Design a protein around this ligand. Sequence first.
Ligand SMILES: Cc1cc(NC(=O)NCCS(=O)(=O)c2ccccc2)no1
Lengths: 179, 177
Amino acid sequence: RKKEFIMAELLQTEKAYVRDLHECLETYLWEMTSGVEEIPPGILNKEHIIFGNIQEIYDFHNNIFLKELEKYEQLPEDVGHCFVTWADKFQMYVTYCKNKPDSNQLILEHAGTFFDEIQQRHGLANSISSYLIKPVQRVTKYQLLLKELLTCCEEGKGELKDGLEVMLSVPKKANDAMH
Amino acid sequence: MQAIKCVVVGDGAVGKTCLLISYTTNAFPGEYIPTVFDNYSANVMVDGKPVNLGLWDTAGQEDYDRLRPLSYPQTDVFLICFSLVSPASFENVRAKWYPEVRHHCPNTPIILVGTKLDLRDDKDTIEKLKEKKLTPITYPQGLAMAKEIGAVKYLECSALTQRGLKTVFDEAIRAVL
Ligand SMILES: Cc1cc(NC(=O)NCCS(=O)(=O)c2ccccc2)no1
């Protein structure tokens, strides 16, 4: 039962993450790249600095990773292999974290209430800052879920150990990349 | 309407996720303790005046010294937590949590929260502790830690019994108005 609770959370939280990145892209990013609203000169064409590579992270999770986790729904003890398979894609969290301080300062110093206006307009509970921390959260959270699986799966579970090793290494590499 | 970002930091042993889940759902999750608490906001009324309170978890990031501070900027209040039945977590307030929080957010108020109050009177826990030549963390210890770090309050709570829980977050808000 515990292994299934965890896989169920893994999947439910993955869907939410995909939903949240999607929201972020289609509200905050879209308004800027639209040219429907008037954009502060401080941030103009600096969407690459604000959102870093989050499009690419979304595409990964939305085209591939969620489809593949789903396939492991009845295979919790093997789901570490999913991460092994797709390890290279997680390197894009390294790029993302690197950029995050730059994104954050940029927003303080030069966007005033641009994003607050959009938040308010669309009626979102999450600020642009709340959406933009999520990839950092998510990348450190996977390793928690795998540890939980390790507490309740048998010695048919180096199909977790290697998954976990990957998901310990990604955030560390991201961590060690920061200026 | 006033929006409040509140970040919750501390060791894995505090039960950060559990605390937040228990506060927000009004119930200890019991069956299964989820590992994920997604950034939350909700309107509550404090001293009459309604407020939008924002809660960010930090669990998972405890080994990532340069990633954790990504969540720090523009925080209105921090909860620095330790578990009342982990002396290590308590000492970490001083050694790890307070320093990085001050280094990045020098003027942001801190509430010191001792969690797992329900285990401080628990034989099996107390015995597990006696075996390591240790005891639970008592009330004057928390007060003295709070003074040392500049906490506006030291508060104790249980996610399990809900005791002191609502108060923790009420006081997080009162420290910003
Ligand atoms: C934060 C936080 C947690 C808490 N109290 C807490 O965890 N008490 C121990 C719970 S247990 O381990 O006995 C247990 C029993 C049944 C299902 C699951 C767990 N107070 O603050």
